[PDB]
Amino acid sequence: NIPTLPQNDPRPEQRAQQLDKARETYKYADLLPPLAFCEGVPKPDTPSAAWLVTVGKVAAAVALNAVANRRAWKRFDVGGTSEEDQNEAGHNSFLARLENPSVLDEVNERVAAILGAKPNRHVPPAQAGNVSKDGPNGRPQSMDDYANLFRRITLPPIASTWKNDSAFAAYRVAGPNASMIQRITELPDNFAVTDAHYKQAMGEGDSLDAAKAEGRLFLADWKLIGETLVNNTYKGAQKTVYAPLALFAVPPGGGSLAPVAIQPGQTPSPTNKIYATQDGNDWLAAKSAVQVAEGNYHELVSHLGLTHLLLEPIVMATYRQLAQHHPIYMLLIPHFEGTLSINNSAATNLIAPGGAVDLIFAGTIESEHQLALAALKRHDFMRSGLPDTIEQRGVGDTSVLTDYPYRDDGLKIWANIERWVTAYVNNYYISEANVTQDTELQAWAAVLSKPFAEGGVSGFGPIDTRAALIFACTKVIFTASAEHSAVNFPQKDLMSYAPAITGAGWTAAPPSQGPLKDFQPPLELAELQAEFLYLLGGVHHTKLGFYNSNSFPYRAWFKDPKITAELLPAFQRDLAASEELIVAANATRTFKYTYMIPSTIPMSINI
Amino acid sequence: NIPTLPQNDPRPEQRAQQLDKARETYKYADLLPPLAFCEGVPKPDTPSAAWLVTVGKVAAAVA
Secondary structure, eight states: OOOOOGGGOSOHHHHHHHHHHHHHHSOEEOSSTTSOEESSOOGGGSOOHHHHHHHHHHHHHHHHHHHHHHHHSOOOHHHHHHHHHHHHHHHHHHTGGGOOOTTTHHHHHHHHHHHTTOSOOSOTTOOOOOOOTTSSOSSOSSTHHHHHHOSSSOOOGGGGTTTSHHHHHHHHHSSSSOSOOEEOSSOOTTOOOOHHHHHHHHTTTSOHHHHHHTTOEEEEEOHHHHTTOOBOEETTEEOBOOOOEEEEEOOTTSBOOEEEEEESSSSOOSSOOOEETTOTHHHHHHHHHHHHHHHHHIIIIIIIIIIIHHHHHHHHHHHHHSOTTOHHHHHHGGGGTTHHHHHHHIIIIISSTTSHHHHHSSBOHHHHHHHHHHHHHSOOGGGOOHHHHHHHHTOOOTTTBOOOHHHHHHHHHHHHHHHHHHHHHHHHOOSTHHHHTOHHHHHHHHHHTSOGGGTOOTTOOOOOSHHHHHHHHHHHHHHHTHHHHHHHTHIIIIISSTTTSOSOBSSSOSSOOSSGGGSSOOHHHHHHHHHHHHHHTSOOOSOTTOOOOSSTTOOOOOOOHHIIIIIHHHHHHHHHHHHHHHHHHHHTOSSOOOSSOTTTOOSSOOO | OOOOOGGGOSSHHHHHHHHHHHHHHSOEEOSSTTSOEESSOOGGGSOOHHHHHHHHHHHHHHO
16 A cells, blocks of 8 residues: 555545545544644543553552552551552553553543542552541641652652752753743843852852853743633642743853843842842742743643643544545554543643642632643644744754753754654655645644634644645654653653652742751642552653554554655654664763653653 | 730741641632622521520421
């Protein structure tokens, strides 16, 4: 079988009849308004058992850790629970492993009980108003209690180093949201830092004017958090989030990023003052307040917004407009594995009312939605390529800001993808008339070019060039694989620990209030945070460059001998070439960056 | 017993646990919008037998 454009398909009637049957299977719902969503999980897009089994082991360790925290609290009911969970681990290792039941209900019910933050989360099919006081809950005794929630799951290393200024700066170039900073040459009028703040961070020898002139000033601005969020509460306790402006700078002659000053509010006042590198406790909080904002910004703008919810229209359009005999359907569809079934998980649980995001994060569940919608609307899809957004922010000079792993590691995977896409498009599209006369590709684009208020992708289109088609598939494949990896997997490593970063500050503000233990979430929310972020960030299913099917066969997915025996190996070769560069770079690093290592990138978005 | 402000209280941690338990009994509800209501009627604040009797005398007259 060789894919072909519709205008060349020897049997257009057979083809176009498959699309008619396909548009039935993939209909539209309103699971999230303004956004174009799928009605339920269509049958062939059911998660494969391999995805379930790989998940199931994670959704088992996280419930075991929960049981261990229920033995500690109150130092045979929480014992029979422990043995039931390990028997499911016994099932997972053998039952669905026969391949040619337990995968059916349990694995998906467990993922939902954790994403939905439901209590009684201990054993499934064991069915036989405050939080249960037989587990960790309420205010803590000392900061030990957070690190000790990690019992059957390993405490991530960031828990032992998050206070260092060097690691607070690592979060902006190697953290979850690693595309936030932007170079400036004059300070914003509402954030006028002084030469004193600067020298207290860059030494007396350097100057604030000397950095903005040499392009050595980089600013991050969570201004969007203010224009959207509404500070909810939790059982009376006021959770809070600011819209901070945080300045960074590099040494003269290049080097790593390092923090300068932090203003928690957008507008200066007797309540909103700049905090600097030498302000002791009011400086540790000014960073902890910054991390609360990124926790919201990452999870709803960087994460769910611009990977999970941005690709959801693109998946739906592809099933309804491109035939199964279309070659672009062949380029993209395997990059959409589990994307339809994981978005239904987030929309109806993780971000649904009463979910993990409503509880652990500061804003109301509805203002958090409006946060993601605000960013989904202001995006320019055609001007959002990875090298495109590097020169927008001014982070392009690898001799001034020289420690930016997401930039240098991502840009290598981007070039590997665009080349493989370019090698792919030009094989199937040979003339420019092949694009414009493609009635499916132009129909596809017509629904993807609808206004944002009608389910479309903002800034998308027009797709009239082989260049425009290459980029569109390049951006889709990049955000389904590399970009999604850079935002999904730091959850387990850098965000499961609450004092390192969480969705809410539980005291008022950076002006230090008392013992550090007060700024931190309650133990029921601190454990849940460590338990649902561990789940979404610990599953590495499918691999970029390797195209299989969602069936137990897991057989070769392409069929054209041109791609399989020639074009795809060039991509796999190129990825393995970049693999040896990033591993080489990372050994010389102290803050490791492993989210662009192509032996770990997924093809798709599926946790 | 003699009432005390919290900063002067000689048994302050026991004082905090009572407020943690008091906040269980007196939760908030949205029985009326832009207002702060109580979830049902907490058991300590149920009507007294004297309030019930004095009303029932009138409730019978209306009946």
